[PDB]
Amino acid sequence: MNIFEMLRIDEGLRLKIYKDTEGYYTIGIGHLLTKSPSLNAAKSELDKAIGRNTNGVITKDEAEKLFNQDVDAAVRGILRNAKLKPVYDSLDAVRRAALINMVFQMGETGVAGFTNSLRMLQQKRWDEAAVNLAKSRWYNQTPNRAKRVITTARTGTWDAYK
């Protein structure tokens, strides 16, 4: 199992614009198109992102192309971030995938804000980190996905995804 397969499980694949959990216009593999209520602003962004006139529909390849760009941006966002970087450098490869999942989902800023949890992740205090991570809107809004990511972080194994 790897970050890509982990995220494709968590986000699904949709070839047609849809709304996310939060209500935002999304497409492919968790690719947020806009937070604007307009489906027309969504089609615009979508067309921009893809380089073509899509009419709200994309091919599998296109969805994969977007996903590759997003995981990449996610990793680079982590390594460019003064709050995130140290935590990541300190982690083994499984737990790293966990932080990457979070950043893909909630943006760098979002995660960078989990101050306390990042600190316990750094100090390798797994259980406590797991408990603190659960005290978040994130966990309350998307409990099953969050529980999965959180267990990956606590344990350093891919069990929750098996």
- For position 122 contacting Cl ion by CB under 5 A, the verdict is no
Are the C-beta atoms of 155 and 126 separated by less than 8 Å? Answer: yes
Among 23, 51, 92, 144, binds Cl ion (CB under 5 A): 144
Extract the tokens encoding 101: 């999942």
Sequence-ordered list of residues with C-beta below 8 angstroms from that of 162, at least 6 positions apart, any chain: 1
- 145 forms part of the interface with Cl ion (CB under 5 A): yes
Q: Does 40 bind Cl ion (CB under 5 A)?
A: no
Q: Note whether 142 binds Cl ion by CB under 5 A.
A: yes
Q: How far is CA 87 from the centre of its chain?
A: 17
Is residue 44 marked as binding? no
Nearer to Cl ion, 10 or 120 (CB): 10
Residue whose CB is less far from Cl ion, 49 or 149: 49
Residue 49 or 112: which CB sits closer to Cl ion? Answer: 49
Q: How far apart are CA 42 and CA 46, in angstroms?
A: 6
State which H helix or E strand residue 7 sits in: helix 3-11
Positions annotated as catalytic residues are 11, 20
Interacting residue ranges for Cl ion, rule: CB under 5 A: 49, 142, 144-145
